[PDB]
Amino acid sequence: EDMPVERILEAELAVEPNDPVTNICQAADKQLFTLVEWAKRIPHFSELPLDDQVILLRAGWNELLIASFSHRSIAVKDGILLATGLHVHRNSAHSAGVGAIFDRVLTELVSKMRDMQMDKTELGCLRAIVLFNPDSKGLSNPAEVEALREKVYASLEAYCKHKYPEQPGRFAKLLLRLPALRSIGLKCLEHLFFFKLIGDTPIDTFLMEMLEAP
Amino acid sequence: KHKILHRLLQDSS
Numbered sequence: 001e002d003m004p005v006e007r008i009l010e011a012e013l014a015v016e017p018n019d020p021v022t023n024i025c026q027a028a029d030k031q032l033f034t035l036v037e038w039a040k041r042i043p044h045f046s047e048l049p050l051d052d053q054v055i056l057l058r059a060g061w062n063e064l065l066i067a068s069f070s071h072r073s074i075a076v077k078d079g080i081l082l083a084t085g086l087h088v089h090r091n092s093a094h095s096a097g098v099g100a101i102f103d104r105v106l107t108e109l110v111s112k113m114r115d116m117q118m119d120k121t122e123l124g125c126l127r128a129i130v131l132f133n134p135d136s137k138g139l140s141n142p143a144e145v146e147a148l149r150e151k152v153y154a155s156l157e158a159y160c161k162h163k164y165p166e167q168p169g170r171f172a173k174l175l176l177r178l179p180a181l182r183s184i185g186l187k188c189l190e191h192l193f194f195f196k197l198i199g200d201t202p203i204d205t206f207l208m209e210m211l212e213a214p
Numbered sequence: 215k216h217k218i219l220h221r222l223l224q225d226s227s
């Protein structure tokens with residue numbers, strides 16, 4: 001066990017906390033600082049070269065944040081809970097002109113996480129898989145990252161089989177939220193690039209740094 | 215040019 005699910009859960013538990021789009025952007029900036037602390041507690045992340053640690057977090061931050069507020073929001077009806085303590089109701093999101101992408105988050109992520117009772121170990125592992133993205137451009141050693149990804153999904157499958165032996169399809173169900181998370185990430189990014197371009201919305205320095213070119 | 219991310223990743227604690 002070079003990738004124990006106990007350490008991945010510890011990482012989740014260690015970091016656990018009108019324009020709605022202004023509140024969302026403040027929350028995203030705040031959570032980017034927490035995301036660096038989270039990543040440092042994932043086994044073997046901090047032993048990668050610093051340039052590769054940067055490429056992985058620049059590639060994955062939007063998906064990692066989306067995964068976290070989505071899991072956080074499973075107790076909420078028709079909304080999301082931000083790390084800042086604030087709720088965005090689907091009605092506010094529709095009235096701010098981001099209804100369609102907000103409903104995608106509710107339907108494809110929050111609802112599906114709620115229905116299967118995805119647990120914080122499962123969430124941690126999915127986020128670790130996102131983080132260890134071996135397709136990220138410019139990695140010095142994509143094979144090392146691929147090896148870390150393989151160890152995360154080996155540990156996750158063993159955890160699922162042990163913890164939920166009645167649900168043989170559960171491992172595959174977890175992995176098959178990742179295409180939805182990818183598509184929703186890209187659409188959320190497109191919204192952010194627009195907010196920046198129109199200048200309609202304050203963007204704080206870490207969020208702004210993540211939107212700057214590579 | 216990613217000042218803030220480099221600084222946070224380097225700092226141990």
Ligand SMILES: CN(c1cc(C(F)(F)F)nc(OCCC(=O)O)n1)c1cccc2c1CCC2
Pocket residue numbers: 024025027028029031061062063065066068069080081082083084098101102105185188189191192
């Ligand atoms: C809430 N929000 C986001 C989207 C994003 C991302 F796209 F940059 F990754 N980041 C955040 O972080 C909030 C962090 C937190 O409180 O845990 N919040 C969102 C949800 C639905 C639609 C849209 C948006 C932001 C753009 C449009």
